Design an enzyme around this catalytic site. Structure first.
Site, PDB file in Angstrom:
ATOM      1  N   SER A 157     -12.278 -47.292  12.073  1.00  0.00           N
ATOM      2  CA  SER A 157     -13.817 -47.534  12.405  1.00  0.00           C
ATOM      3  C   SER A 157     -14.536 -48.568  12.075  1.00  0.00           C
ATOM      4  O   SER A 157     -15.646 -49.145  12.721  1.00  0.00           O
ATOM      5  CB  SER A 157     -14.395 -46.255  12.879  1.00  0.00           C
ATOM      6  OG  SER A 157     -15.887 -46.454  13.328  1.00  0.00           O
ATOM      7  N   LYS A 163     -20.592 -50.468   6.775  1.00  0.00           N
ATOM      8  CA  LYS A 163     -19.907 -50.064   7.955  1.00  0.00           C
ATOM      9  C   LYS A 163     -18.636 -49.040   7.366  1.00  0.00           C
ATOM     10  O   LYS A 163     -17.971 -49.546   6.788  1.00  0.00           O
ATOM     11  CB  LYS A 163     -19.341 -50.817   8.952  1.00  0.00           C
ATOM     12  CG  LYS A 163     -18.538 -50.159  10.019  1.00  0.00           C
ATOM     13  CD  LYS A 163     -19.760 -49.499  10.915  1.00  0.00           C
ATOM     14  CE  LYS A 163     -19.149 -48.900  12.152  1.00  0.00           C
ATOM     15  NZ  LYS A 163     -18.431 -47.528  11.633  1.00  0.00           N
ATOM     16  N   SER A 164     -19.270 -47.760   7.557  1.00  0.00           N
ATOM     17  CA  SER A 164     -17.992 -46.686   7.342  1.00  0.00           C
ATOM     18  C   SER A 164     -17.102 -46.644   8.506  1.00  0.00           C
ATOM     19  O   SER A 164     -16.998 -47.131   9.444  1.00  0.00           O
ATOM     20  CB  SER A 164     -18.684 -45.359   7.079  1.00  0.00           C
ATOM     21  OG  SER A 164     -19.474 -44.903   8.245  1.00  0.00           O
ATOM     22  N   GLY A 165     -15.959 -45.810   7.803  1.00  0.00           N
ATOM     23  CA  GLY A 165     -14.702 -45.552   8.669  1.00  0.00           C
ATOM     24  C   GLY A 165     -14.011 -44.285   8.234  1.00  0.00           C
ATOM     25  O   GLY A 165     -14.141 -43.947   6.986  1.00  0.00           O
TER      26      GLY A 165
END
EC number: 3.5.2.6
Length: 253
Positions: free
Chosen positions: A39, A197-199
């Site tokens: 993601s 920005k996480s994933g």
């Protein structure tokens, strides 16, 4: 804290890559090791789109039909049979991690093929995009390395061909995102500004965060890439590892 001790304490695998963009100093740990990127891919795609659309053109609209909807589309599900703007598509994807929204972006860019093209152009022959939340140590599908992804971030955004407006837009979103509050943002000194920005992937406790870290009075970011996983398919991630790793790393800066 040694990175080893963190792998030991959390019984997890850590992949790190930091670049202070001012000095060029690098911090690396399992930097050529592959992990699901998943993601965190959202920031890349939005970034690509920003390269072809001037800020003044973000108000252009695209139609959404039933055939567009994909699972986890918190925002877009409401657009069925309506028109949405390019700007709102970037937003739903980056702030709400909207699946349909990400998919529309990619199409708009010209498909996965074109993203693949842009990557190679940048020097990225590692990152392997998917035509997302799935991971298996078996495959190299949906994977990158901390060094590779880190190089792409820098080249795409920190020092890419974005306009001030486009760069600002995107950075503002990564800055204001509540979904990373538990990661790199939890870990760094309170004077630091973190646009992340996480994933994640549903397998192997695959949990990552990527950011542009702005130290106290320093205009140039430190790109930080953290990729963690574990040994079992059904293992559950612990967000503190990331927080803990970020903290450790910031110290070399």
């Amino acid at each position: 804290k040694e990175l080893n001790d963190l792998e030991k304490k959390y019984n997890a695998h850590i992949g790190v890559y930091a670049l202070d963009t001012k000095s060029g100093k690098e911090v690396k740990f399992n930097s050529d090791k592959r992990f699901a990127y998943a993601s965190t891919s959202k920031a890349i795609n939005s970034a690509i789109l920003l390269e072809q659309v001037p800020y003044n053109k973000l108000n252009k609209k695209v139609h959404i039909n039933k055939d567009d909807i994909v699972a986890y589309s918190p925002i877009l599900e409401k657009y069925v049979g309506k028109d949405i703007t390019l700007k709102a598509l970037i937003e739903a994807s980056m702030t709400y991690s909207d699946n349909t929204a990400n998919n529309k972006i990619i199409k708009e860019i010209g498909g996965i093929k074109k993203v693949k093209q842009r990557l190679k152009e940048l020097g990225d022959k590692v990152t392997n995009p998917v035509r997302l939340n799935y991971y298996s140590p078996k495959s190299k599908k949906n994977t990158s390395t901390p060094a590779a992804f880190g190089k792409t971030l820098n080249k795409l955004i920190a020092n890419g061909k974005l306009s001030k407006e486009n760069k600002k837009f995107l950075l503002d979103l990564m800055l204001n995102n509540k979904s990373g509050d538990t990661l790199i943002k939890d870990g760094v000194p309170k004077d630091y500004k973190v646009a992340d920005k996480s994933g994640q992937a549903i397998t192997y406790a695959s949990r990552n965060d990527v950011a542009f870290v702005y130290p106290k009075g320093q205009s140039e970011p430190i790109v930080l890439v953290i990729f963690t996983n574990k040994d079992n398919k059904s293992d559950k991630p612990n967000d503190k590892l990331i927080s803990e790793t970020a903290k450790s790393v910031m110290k070399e800066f």
